[PDB]
Design a protein around this nucleic acid. Structure first.
Ligand SMILES: [Mg+2]
Ligand SMILES: [Mg+2]
Ligand SMILES: [Mg+2]
Ligand SMILES: [Zn+2]
Lengths: 109, 129, 146, 126, 242
RNA sequence: UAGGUAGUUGGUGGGGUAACGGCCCACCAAGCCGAAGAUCGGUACGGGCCGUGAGAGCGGGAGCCCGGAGAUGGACACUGAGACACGGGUCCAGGCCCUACGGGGCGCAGCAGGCGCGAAACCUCCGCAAUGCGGGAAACCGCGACGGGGGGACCCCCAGU
């Protein structure tokens, strides 16, 4: 079984395109995040959301924050809305796609 | 509605002992409530206590000694580093060792005087003096 | 009234918003952030200014008082405005003549406004023809240009 | 004056006011449309840092290839079905996906002529 | 910093391993490109004039430089912008003294004096390894200097090893392997200039570098990065480290 | 100041670049931001830091160092490792200067000095001996950078009558 430098398990199918890190000619290098999908309307792209807490200092309380990014969605792991995904960083793929989906966790619920 | 069974207890205690009573009943009884009674006892603020079961979450009988000035809950439950205690002891207590400040450290519930001996921190839940 | 509104642990955003919302019911802050003093101020954020006097006048004092305070009309140079300025001292008005250049400061009252029984005046004369007025009033120096 | 810098419109739809001017290191050049002719012409450019770029402008031969690695320098006739642009196969513009019709069959171009200054192809099967 | 490269340097914004007085004057020397990098090396003038004191102004330090008096790594250097760096052997052959450049215990550079029969070898760490035309092996060293080895000894020279070469000639002798049991001397970081033996090596995925755990003489386990540990001898060091 | 976007968001095949990219092009779709403030207006060079307060905080970011941008306003190219170049080149707009009336030129937000504006800010000085930079095999040569003085109730420290 092939690894790419993440110590995780590959997908159970084979792809076509060359913009896939598992089966093609793409290289991943950088940050490694984790979120849940909020749309996949256009072709081969998703939108992933993650949440964190900001700590104000004058009032000493917390505050909820978000971050929405866009990721390439190779045809061997095509992710729908409402499921956890691991995403990695690589070169610019379009005007606003700079990440790629590598593994899907918890499909349905 | 009901949101905090620990605050109700501590306000009940400081309201009762201010008019001269010698026994109270802490009705909804967690085990956090019992754990804080345990450390209010070792420092000599209350007498002896027992857990009575009534079919619905149980009650607590506690006898007072008339030995406390004020008790209450530190509500928002701020966290503290193991070297930043005096900043809070100067805000709640009246002199440089007057009374205890109860801390919910990762090894149970204890007063800040025993947290500084191990050098740990946690959430502040209450204070008695 | 209850306790106080957002005393939660994860309610930082609403607490900051309530403060920023009610800070605008102030007057020292709204007036400092919107910059309302400039845009309506004949001197334009200066401590002093210079003008050329048009006519000499006399004002009546307040109610529990009596007497006439002497003043002049100054026509500024950086703007072109016309203000009313007060000549402090015993016999000073006999040293101010028309077609003279005068220097102008504030009069130092509450909030920057006016002071005492001269209620509408808010500037005072300090220099005449590049020669201080305080001197001229008490001898000690002579007035150039006639 | 072909500036290849940033864009002037945020992904949300608001406009951007440029803060500087155009740097000389961001510019672009003209597309070198390769034609078919009876003699191939090519020029040489000096590039950023002093390098060079050979630039083909008219095409005569093809360098067609095979499955056993056997090339042959044969000349081309015309282009058919360039998927890049809709009206290239008519004007005989060779870009990179072009289907070249050599004198020994068909072939598909696998090199960039305007960048290398050669035409290479694989012997397309029927 | 607009149209081209920088050419001057300020006393305020100088590298903080130099032993210079930062308020006495305005300009410092902009070091020429050369062997080591800029956070681990020092121009050649600040050794002739400030450290050793053989000159008082620069005009009389640039007169003894271009007379063939200073021998940095066995060879004569003449310009005042040459960078001198870690594990170099500066040597004045007329007066008869030798030195070694090393990092301090707080991070600055010194001139620890060494013997004469030891002023002849220099340690070198292996940074990379590649294959060049003719199928040979090129070893790239820690101060950007190279060496070629056949394709039959590609089994003795993995990276992070250490090689001991005669200075003005560069003939290899006595490679030192990297493993558990060897003697290391730290170069940068927060454990600067501490010695010891190796206990462990730990590896991480996805880009991050790996760490090394060390044990010194009195007995204390600390750790550093793996490429900060400079292997100098196995079980007993070879360099007269201070 | 409630809706904004139509190369705008994405895909397939390409051109161009030192290089990835709707950065440009030919086709196929209908995506993309937004009451957790999008869009449009207002003001503003960003930071290390600085003033004030017992602290929580409130106010400022001229001078020293580090990044960005500009050379009367707007467009554009040649040479080079690097520029679309403050003391290098074209064109337009807006000022001024020399001319034998045919033609030529110039733009101190470099250092002193001048006018105008204003309540508001200095000498048309001496030197390459020191720190550094460019050139040279080297001794050296140049530098209003830097170094030395002149003018001024600029801020601190130590004294006199
Ligand atoms: Mg593409
Ligand atoms: Mg501005
Ligand atoms: Mg002044
Ligand atoms: Zn795949």
């Amino acid at each position: 079984v092939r690894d790419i430098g993440l110590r995780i398990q590959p997908p159970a199918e084979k792809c076509d395109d060359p913009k896939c890190p598992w089966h093609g000619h793409l290289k991943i290098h950088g940050r490694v995040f984790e979120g849940i999908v909020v749309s996949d309307k256009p072709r081969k792209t998703v939108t992933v959301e993650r949440q964190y807490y900001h700590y104000l200092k004058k009032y000493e309380r917390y505050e909820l924050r978000r971050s929405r990014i866009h990721a390439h969605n190779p045809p061997c792991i095509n992710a729908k809305v409402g499921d956890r995904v691991l995403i990695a960083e690589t070169r610019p793929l379009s005007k606003t796609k700079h990440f790629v989906v590598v593994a899907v966790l918890e499909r349905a619920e | 509605t009901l949101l905090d069974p620990l605050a109700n207890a501590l306000s009940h205690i400081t309201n009762s002992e201010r008019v001269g009573k010698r026994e109270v009943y802490i009705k909804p009884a967690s085990k956090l409530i019992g754990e804080v009674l345990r450390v209010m006892q070792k420092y000599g603020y209350i007498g002896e206590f027992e857990f009575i079961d009534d079919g619905r979450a149980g009650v607590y009988r506690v006898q007072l000694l008339g030995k406390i000035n004020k008790a209450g809950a530190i509500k928002p439950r701020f966290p503290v580093k193991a070297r930043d205690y005096e900043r809070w002891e100067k805000r709640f207590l009246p002199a440089f060792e007057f009374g205890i400040l109860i801390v919910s450290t990762s090894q149970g519930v204890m007063s800040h005087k025993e947290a500084r001996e191990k050098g740990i921190g946690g959430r502040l839940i209450a204070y008695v003096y | 009234p209850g306790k106080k509104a957002p005393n939660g642990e994860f309610a930082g955003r609403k607490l900051k918003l309530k403060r920023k919302k009610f800070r605008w019911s102030d007057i020292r802050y709204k007036r400092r952030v919107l910059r309302l003093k400039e845009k309506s101020d004949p001197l334009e954020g200066a401590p002093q200014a210079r003008g050329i006097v048009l006519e000499k006048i006399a004002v009546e004092a307040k109610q529990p008082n009596s007497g006439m305070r002497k003043a002049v009309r100054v026509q500024l140079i950086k703007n072109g405005k016309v203000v009313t300025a007060f000549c402090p001292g015993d016999g000073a008005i006999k040293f101010i003549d028309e077609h003279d250049e005068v220097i102008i400061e504030g009069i130092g009252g509450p909030k920057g406004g006016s002071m005492g029984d001269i209620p509408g005046i808010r500037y005072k004369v300090v220099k005449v023809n590049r020669v201080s007025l305080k001197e001229l009033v008490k001898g000690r120096k002579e007035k150039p240009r006639r | 004056a072909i500036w290849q810098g940033r864009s002037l419109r945020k992904p949300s739809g608001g406009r951007i006011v440029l803060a500087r001017k155009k740097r000389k290191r961001e510019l672009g050049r003209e597309p070198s449309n390769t034609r078919v002719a009876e003699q191939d012409k090519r020029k040489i450019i000096r590039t950023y840092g002093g390098n060079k770029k050979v630039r083909l402008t008219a095409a005569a031969y093809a360098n067609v290839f095979d499955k056993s690695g056997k090339g042959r320098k044969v000349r081309i006739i015309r282009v058919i079905e360039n998927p890049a642009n809709r009206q290239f196969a008519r004007r005989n513009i060779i870009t990179k996906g072009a289907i070249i019709e050599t004198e020994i069959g068909k072939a598909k171009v696998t090199s960039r002529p305007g960048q290398d200054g050669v035409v290479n192809a694989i012997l397309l099967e029927e | 910093a607009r149209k081209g490269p920088k050419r001057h340097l300020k006393r305020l914004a100088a590298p903080t391993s130099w032993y210079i007085e930062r308020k006495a004057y305005k300009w410092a020397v902009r070091p020429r490109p050369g062997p080591h990098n800029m956070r681990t090396s020092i121009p050649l003038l600040y050794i002739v004039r400030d450290y050793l004191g053989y000159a008082k102004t620069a005009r009389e330090a640039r007169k003894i430089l271009n007379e063939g008096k200073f021998l940095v790594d066995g060879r004569v250097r003449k310009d005042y912008k040459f960078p001198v760096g870690i594990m170099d052997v500066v040597s004045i052959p007329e007066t008869g003294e030798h030195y070694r450049v090393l990092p301090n215990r707080i991070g600055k550079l010194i001139l620890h004096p060494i013997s004469e029969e030891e002023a002849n070898i220099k340690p070198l760490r292996i940074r990379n390894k590649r294959m060049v035309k003719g199928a040979k092996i090129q070893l790239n060293f820690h101060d950007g200097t190279n060496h070629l080895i056949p394709l039959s000894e590609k089994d003795n020279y993995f990276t992070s090893y250490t090689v001991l070469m005669k200075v003005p000639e560069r003939e290899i002798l006595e490679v030192l392997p990297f493993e558990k049991g060897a003697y290391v001397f730290v170069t940068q970081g927060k454990n600067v200039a501490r010695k010891g033996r190796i206990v462990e090596i730990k590896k991480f995925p996805m880009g991050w570098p790996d760490v090394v755990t060390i044990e010194d003489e009195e007995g204390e386990l600390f750790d550093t990065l793996k490429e900060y540990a400079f292997v100098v001898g196995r079980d007993k060091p070879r360099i007269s480290l201070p």
